[PDB]
Design a protein around this ligand. Structure first.
Ligand SMILES: O=C(O)c1c(Sc2ccccc2)c2cc(Cl)ccc2n1Cc1ccccc1
Ligand SMILES: O=C(O)c1c(Sc2ccccc2)c2cc(Cl)ccc2n1Cc1ccccc1
Lengths: 256, 259
């Protein structure tokens, strides 16, 4: 079904839509001379220095929300290039985005993570995992599930060209709640799955059942989203003067 | 290693037959009505007579009685799944702590997978095919019980649209059990080595058993996302039912509190 051209089309659109690729993320993280070293936020003192180079825990959590809004915009731009996506019923285009966007944010956040922390500000900073664990409850563990996923996910050693197809497979899920026309979505995903299987065969010939192992990770992705909405509710129960961005309000209402 | 992937599939199907008395083929021969015939539980009157007619190990307000009956049966299911697990080549040679971990986290997923075999859009087979409880009758139960089975009916309708048979499911259940991502595993290596052979066996099985069915392997694997979700929301529903229901023997409590 011209699976190689489709693989490449997706990869090009992914490079067009997302400003920080995994290749660049890894080059920054491992001190390559193609890129610049990051400023490191590891405690309250360096955070305050990082923000220039009321409560800090709420302010970090809010920063993450805002970068997530830009991330939703990038995802949506990417999704328009997925062949067939813009031809679907408009309500279905909304539904697929509403349910897929966090699973994609988390997939792609793995690209910015190692076991010790996460790239921030398109890779200009690096915030440590230990600093994030040190924040006030309930904010001291909101990133832990994402780190634990990133470590496992990153062991698959996927590259940008593998990830572009994988993210498209995620968006085109005909099992999302409240879809009107399931069949045209499954037809699209069928092609994307074929392209993914072929991409992994060619790109990882020595890697047994990599296709299967990647699809199984979709399970972890969904549980992160599930846990995250549980955490949001705990924050709603226990926190007061706390504002949520309109775009995120729409996504979360009423997700799971 | 095609011939032995086929032997593995045949071996697993044979053990599945041995371990699970009510199979999908049998459940389907009842649900489509292909002939015994089930006693129907469509309302409170029929429930009452059903309890007198069918055996029931559970024979308290109705919604409670049903939910405890379900738990009692789930505990029975765990021992069938455990027996089956022990027939998966390599499983009984794993570190004992790891066997326990795989079963602890795997049984729930397997219970819901196999419950789909007993279900259609209209209701569920109960007591070994001897009964049938309507989906509508479950919805009518008072909150929080009216909403408890609905997500499972949702899952089953999407899962059953794959049209898997017992031979497919035998290998799929094994794949579920041998997951190297369960927390607290000591030795992930042999677990993933077994799962790898099982995945290869499953891939071939689906290709041969469903030649006209594109990306069925992939679609089945992605069904695991909705499965885990069902399980997570079920456990939190139990951990609200428990904390809030007064109708829920100390000795019996000990047996049935966990799966
Ligand atoms: O602005 C950012 O790039 C950023 C932020 S914003 C921020 C970071 C440090 C100090 C203040 C704000 C962020 C926060 C967390 Cl807890 C985790 C990851 C974060 N990132 C990186 C990120 C990348 C993709 C999607 C969301 C966030
Ligand atoms: O005892 C049973 O066979 C049964 C029960 S027990 C029961 C059924 C109807 C009325 C009273 C008790 C059950 C209950 C729900 Cl709400 C759903 C499925 C159920 N089943 C069928 C079942 C099969 C496998 C695993 C769990 C349950």
């Amino acid at each position: 079904a011209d699976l190689r051209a489709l693989a490449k089309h997706l990869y090009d659109s992914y490079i067009k839509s997302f400003p920080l690729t995994k290749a660049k993320a890894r080059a920054i993280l491992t001190g390559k001379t193609t890129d610049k070293s990051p400023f490191v936020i590891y405690d309250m003192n360096s955070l305050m220095m990082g923000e220039d180079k009321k409560e800090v825990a709420i302010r970090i959590f809010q920063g993450c929300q805002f970068r997530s809004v830009e991330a939703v915009q990038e995802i949506t731009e990417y999704a328009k290039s997925i062949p067939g996506f813009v031809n679907l019923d408009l309500n279905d285009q909304v539904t697929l985005l509403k349910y897929g966007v966090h699973e994609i944010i988390y997939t792609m956040l793995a690209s910015l993570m190692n076991k010790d922390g996460v790239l921030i500000s398109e890779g200009q900073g690096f915030m440590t995992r230990e600093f994030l664990k040190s924040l006030r409850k309930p904010f001291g563990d909101f990133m832990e599930p994402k780190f634990e996923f990133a470590v496992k996910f990153n062991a698959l050693e996927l590259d940008d060209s593998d990830l572009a197809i994988f993210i498209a497979v995620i968006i085109l899920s005909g099992d999302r709640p409240g879809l009107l026309n399931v069949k045209p979505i499954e037809d699209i995903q069928d092609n994307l799955l074929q392209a993914l299987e072929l991409q992994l065969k060619l790109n990882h010939p020595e890697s047994s059942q990599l296709f299967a192992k990647l699809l199984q990770k979709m399970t972890d992705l969904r549980q992160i989203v599930t846990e995250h909405v549980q955490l949001l509710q705990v924050i709603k129960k226990t926190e007061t003067d706390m504002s949520l961005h309109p775009l995120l309000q729409e996504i979360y209402k009423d997700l799971y």
